[PDB]
Each structure stands twice: as structure tokens, then as C-alpha cells.
Design a protein around this ligand. Sequence first.
Ligand SMILES: O=P(O)(O)O[C@H]1[C@H](OP(=O)(O)O)[C@@H](OP(=O)(O)O)[C@H](OP(=O)(O)O)[C@@H](OP(=O)(O)O)[C@H]1OP(=O)(O)O
Ligand SMILES: O=P(O)(O)O[C@H]1[C@H](OP(=O)(O)O)[C@@H](OP(=O)(O)O)[C@H](OP(=O)(O)O)[C@@H](OP(=O)(O)O)[C@H]1OP(=O)(O)O
Ligand SMILES: [Zn+2]
Length: 158
Amino acid sequence: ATVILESIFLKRSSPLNFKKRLFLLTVQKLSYYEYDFERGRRGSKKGSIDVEKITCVETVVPEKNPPPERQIPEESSETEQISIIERFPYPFQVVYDEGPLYVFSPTEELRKRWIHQLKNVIRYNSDLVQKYHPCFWIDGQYLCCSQTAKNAMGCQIL
Ligand SMILES: O=P(O)(O)O[C@H]1[C@H](OP(=O)(O)O)[C@@H](OP(=O)(O)O)[C@H](OP(=O)(O)O)[C@@H](OP(=O)(O)O)[C@H]1OP(=O)(O)O
Ligand SMILES: O=P(O)(O)O[C@H]1[C@H](OP(=O)(O)O)[C@@H](OP(=O)(O)O)[C@H](OP(=O)(O)O)[C@@H](OP(=O)(O)O)[C@H]1OP(=O)(O)O
Ligand SMILES: [Zn+2]
């Protein structure tokens, strides 16, 4: 039940919005929670995914004109301290039965760390896919294949 990885990520998904969440990875589950900054501790649980139910973990093609909150910097005035909890420019994908979960990492190294660990723990899942969507699902379709089913088969082999 011990946590393998712990990070603050920007989580996405009608109405599409982005919230800061504390992500936890164990061998069994990935849970995400609210972060109580005022008291500096983990807050209320918001979601949990069975690791064995995950079918795909990959990066996502970055959006074209992203808001500052997802754009790399002024980090001379702002230390890494501020930017590492305000800027989340690197997205990756976590696909399970309900569909794709989109998560934004503050650094490339941290995304690399999480994708690597995730791949390790899902290595024996029965349903790993062979095709996936490298582009985000938005307003009823994937931007990579124009397919309008959230669980439509992937259009790219990797
Ligand atoms: O408005 P937030 O504080 O961002 O919470 C949202 C909101 O959930 P709540 O109604 O519980 O506040 C979303 O719900 P809708 O706007 O779809 O009604 C919900 O999505 P789901 O109910 O569809 O699960 C989403 O959660 P998620 O992105 O896990 O789907 C969840 O955001 P958080 O789960 O990240 O707090
Ligand atoms: O939030 P945690 O401290 O990680 O507690 C988890 C969590 O339980 P709750 O979030 O409901 O308290 C798991 O529950 P879910 O994510 O399914 O809702 C549950 O996992 P199981 O589904 O396998 O019961 C698990 O129980 P366990 O570790 O006995 O497997 C339990 O951990 P605790 O027993 O430490 O509360
Ligand atoms: Zn596609």
C-alpha cells in the first residue's frame, strides 16, 4: 500500500476545466486528491484508478496555443519553487475502461518518471492496447483521427 510516486499535477476532465491535484501511485492504485496548501498536507480524495484496469500510458501532442498555466516561462524572478507548482506544460495520457485521463506535468523529467513507473506496473495487464490516440479528445472527438467515440480504437501504432 506504500506510495511509489507522489507529485502535484494539473488534471483535466460538457465543461472542460483544469484542476491542481496531488497524485499518488502505488502498485495497486493511482489516487488523486485535493491538496491543502494552508496546512501543507494531503486533502480529500477525488479519484482512484485500478492499475490493472489501465490499458495505455503515453504522452499527448501538446496543444497549439496554451494558456500560461501550461506554458514554459521569467524564472529569474520566479524561482523554480513557484513555477513547479504553477506551470504544467507537459501532458501525458492514462487510458482505462472509462476512457483517457489527461494529466499535465510541470517538467519533462517528472513526466518521464511517471510514465516509466506506470508502464512498469501495468506490464501484465490483459488489455494493453496496440493502437492509441496521440491527440486529445475534445468536444466530442479525437483531434488525431476525427473519431467521435471516446472508446474508439486508436489510430496510431507505437
Ligand atoms: O468541479 P470540480 O471541483 O473541478 O470537480 C469536478 C466535477 O466534479 P464535482 O461535480 O464532484 O464538483 C466534475 O464533475 P462534472 O462537472 O462532470 O459534474 C468531475 O467529473 P466526474 O463527476 O465526471 O468524475 C471532475 O472529476 P473528473 O475529472 O474526475 O471526472 C471533478 O474534478 P475533480 O475530480 O478533479 O475534483
Ligand atoms: O484511501 P486509502 O487509505 O488508499 O485506502 C484504500 C482505499 O480505500 P478507501 O479510499 O475507500 O478508504 C481502497 O479503496 P478504493 O480506492 O477501492 O475506494 C481500498 O482498496 P480495496 O478496493 O482493495 O479494498 C484499500 O483497502 P486495502 O488496502 O485493504 O486493499 C484502502 O486501503 P486501507 O485498507 O489502508 O484503507
Ligand atoms: Zn486518434
